[PDB]
Design a protein around this ligand. Structure first.
Ligand SMILES: *[C@@H](O)[C@H](C[C@@H]1CCNC1=O)NC(=O)[C@H](CC(C)C)NC(=O)OCc1ccccc1
Ligand code: NA
Length: 220
């Protein structure tokens, strides 16, 4: 596998979004992964509607601003036969009744793939598929104030994840401790957070923060 991967430079990744004060991280992770796979297939990068997922994917098991799962989101798009664009169905940061309109659908999928729970298996997926939806333990003050460098939190759990994000690559940089590898992760907390909305998460460090514990992507 490659030593460094960045799908943003290949055109797979839309700009950083902001979920506001709604527990909809799962919807942004899922649209991010489906935005990448749709571009892989059509060569067109179109931002997808998280509000569509928040409002409409309850029958698949999601609960709006109170949480959800990326796999449930991919199942909705398959069961529903489409997903509306961000411009047609914009984000309001609040759960409402479903307003899906197939005329404005711009995405489809035919299921999803669950990656084995090993950082080695994740590395392979990122290297060959595109951006990957993942879950992490983001519940630590150090994650809120992250600015730069490789993030490592000694009391992060790898069993208890609470936040869905998007791995868009991986790489390295020399560090004091010689733990130099990282996952490149796109968040949904706006541009102001982290490094332009991104974070470098420690890689090959005992599945840090559970990044490899619930990874998946849609099949288009
Ligand atoms: C991210 O914004 C969100 C925060 C949650 C929801 C409101 N309070 C929170 O702490 N995280 C999730 O939605 C999270 C993402 C996973 C990929 C880790 N999932 C979640 O909280 O799921 C709860 C749930 C489990 C099973 C079925 C339905 C809901
Ligand atoms: Na924790």
């Amino acid at each position: 596998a490659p030593r460094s991967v960045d799908w943003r430079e290949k055109g797979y990744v839309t700009p950083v979004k902001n979920q506001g004060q709604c527990g909809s991280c799962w919807a942004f992770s899922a649209t991010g992964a489906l935005e990448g796979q749709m571009f892989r297939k059509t060569g067109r990068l179109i931002s997808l509607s998280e509000q569509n997922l928040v409002d409409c994917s309850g029958p698949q098991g999601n609960e709006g601003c109170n949480g959800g799962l990326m796999d449930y989101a991919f199942q909705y798009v398959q069961d529903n036969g489409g997903l509306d664009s961000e411009e047609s169905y914009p984000y309001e940061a609040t759960e409402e009744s479903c307003k899906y309109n197939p005329k404005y659908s711009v995405a489809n999928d035919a299921g999803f793939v669950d990656i084995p729970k090993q950082e080695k298996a994740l590395m392979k997926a990122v290297a060959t598929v595109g951006p990957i939806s993942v879950a992490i333990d983001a519940g630590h003050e150090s994650f809120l104030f992250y600015k730069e460098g490789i993030y490592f939190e000694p009391d992060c759990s790898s069993e208890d994840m609470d936040h869905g994000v998007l791995v868009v690559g991986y790489g390295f940089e020399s560090t004091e401790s010689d733990n130099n590898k990282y996952w490149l992760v796109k968040n949904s907390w706006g541009e102001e957070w982290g490094m332009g909305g991104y974070v470098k998460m420690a890689k090959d460090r005992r599945n840090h923060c559970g990044i490899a514990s619930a990874a998946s992507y849609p099949t288009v």
